Amino acid sequence: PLLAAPLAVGDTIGFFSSSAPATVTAKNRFFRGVEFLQRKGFKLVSGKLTGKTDFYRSGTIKERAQEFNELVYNPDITCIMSTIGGDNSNSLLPFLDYDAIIANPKIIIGYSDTTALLAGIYAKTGLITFYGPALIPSFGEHPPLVDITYESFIKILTRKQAGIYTYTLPEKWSDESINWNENKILRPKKLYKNNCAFYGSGKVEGRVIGGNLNTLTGIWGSEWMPEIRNGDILFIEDSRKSIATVERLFSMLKLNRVFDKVSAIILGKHELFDCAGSKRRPYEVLTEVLDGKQIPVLDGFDCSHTHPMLTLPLGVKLAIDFDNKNISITEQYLS
């Protein structure tokens, strides 16, 4: 695979808005995120669409593509980070400079709608990109949860590429929809004990592929959707969806013969899942869809829209030990 150079404290991070114009609509949280990373010692370069609005998006399809490409062209930038997701990253794909990405591999990081770019770039270049923090939702989060997000971010991206890396489970998490863009807090978010579960036995090792499942529908069937292969570990997460939508997306995968190929599935914690009164969780819906297929599932991995968020390289081998209840990166993912 194509590998980017590791991050170092003091490096320059460039940020871009490939969909929702949250540098404007969530300006307070945006500034918190900027200040957070600056205090850590990072230099920040604002993408050219920072502070701009085109109603539901940051700008035209071509302007958003240009914003991203310009960060690729900047020789000082080691990490290109999404500001926030939305709905519209997939529009950029015909216009991204994939040859420039190959010529100067950088850490590309984000989540949610940005999956379209992460998966698309991987499909075209083989670059190992990262499912992880976006500037506004992830680093604009108040302490204490932002600190755990940052610890994963910095650990994954700066560590020496010697031996496997085994994730540490966050002790507590939240998906509560408070303290978004308000300047100060009335109270901290409700914290829940980590209910991450390992359904299965033995050890499974395979290339991890996926991201935000709903977002993947926007690139599905195209040359920008990376082929899922025999032995892959499927990583999928969604946010604020109805159980109806979750069934639809799981069945889409079934129809595409995805469950005949995967060695394991990782379900990210689903932010504010709406079970429509059924009290059913996404795993139960998956079980029905699977129709008896014995695929081991890591249910509730902290790499999703919930806080805190771990950083995950996409397109490299992971090992999930279902007996010992841990997950590791086993393949080099930075140069």
Add this chain to the structure above:
Amino acid sequence: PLLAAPLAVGDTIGFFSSSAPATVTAKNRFFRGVEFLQRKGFKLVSGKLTGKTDFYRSGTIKERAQEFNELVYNPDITCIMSTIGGDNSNSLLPFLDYDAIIANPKIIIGYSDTTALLAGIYAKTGLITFYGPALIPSFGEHPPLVDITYESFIKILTRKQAGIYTYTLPEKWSDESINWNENKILRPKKLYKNNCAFYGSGKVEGRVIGGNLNTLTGIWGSEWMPEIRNGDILFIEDSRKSIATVERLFSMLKLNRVFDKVSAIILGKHELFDCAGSKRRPYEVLTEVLDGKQIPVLDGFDCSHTHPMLTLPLGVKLAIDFDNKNISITEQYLS
């Protein structure tokens, strides 16, 4: 293609609930729809899930497939009609009795989420299915608009298969979210003049393919998604979507090279489109996505979630005359 026997006054229509349990949740409208078709002289067979709920759906995946299959097995049934859409009909596709459908061709009709079944059945069997009325939303509609819906339904399905059929444009239409599930209207719906637009010149003739675009994402890439071919006319409609979602779905098509293949696009009227204050219509978004690709577009065809609704056979040749502002079926679609 495989053709069903034509409909006739006095025939038996069977209905099924492949997703939302609206025979319960919209029971008043359901009863009005039943009464409407009965007064027209049709005999009705209730699918086995009528009157049942499993929270967000009518039953399990297998229960819903069974309900549909049992209608196919009934020799008395000429038309199999959706009660309503939802989100979840794509789940049924591995479990439908395609051999029985081939052996016993019937008129399969519905819209919205039911697109998954209409397109899926066509892909597997070559049967010409119909984008058209669902029992509850379409025939439970209060007068005056329900009569125009019915006129199209009965005309398309009972007419002699001799010569081309040219559609009549409804004089007025509405998309207002009122008068849903009560005995009486709150007040009359706003009746809009028909603003259907023909962008382009000359005549385009080709096989029509598509349906509800958001629903198509649930079968996309699979063996149940009919292959789009050079010269096809793409028919797409969506309902109650944000402009953000519409851009995403249009770009999905772009990435899949659909706009390199199709000779024309039909956009169904979009029910309660949310432009996010931009004042932009879906056609404007399509134009940006097309990036200079000249494809003639019929913008605002009355075959969608808006009232009244026309009946359209899928998988047969249509001719759109952009000069004379009309649309015709040019290929036999029933026995």
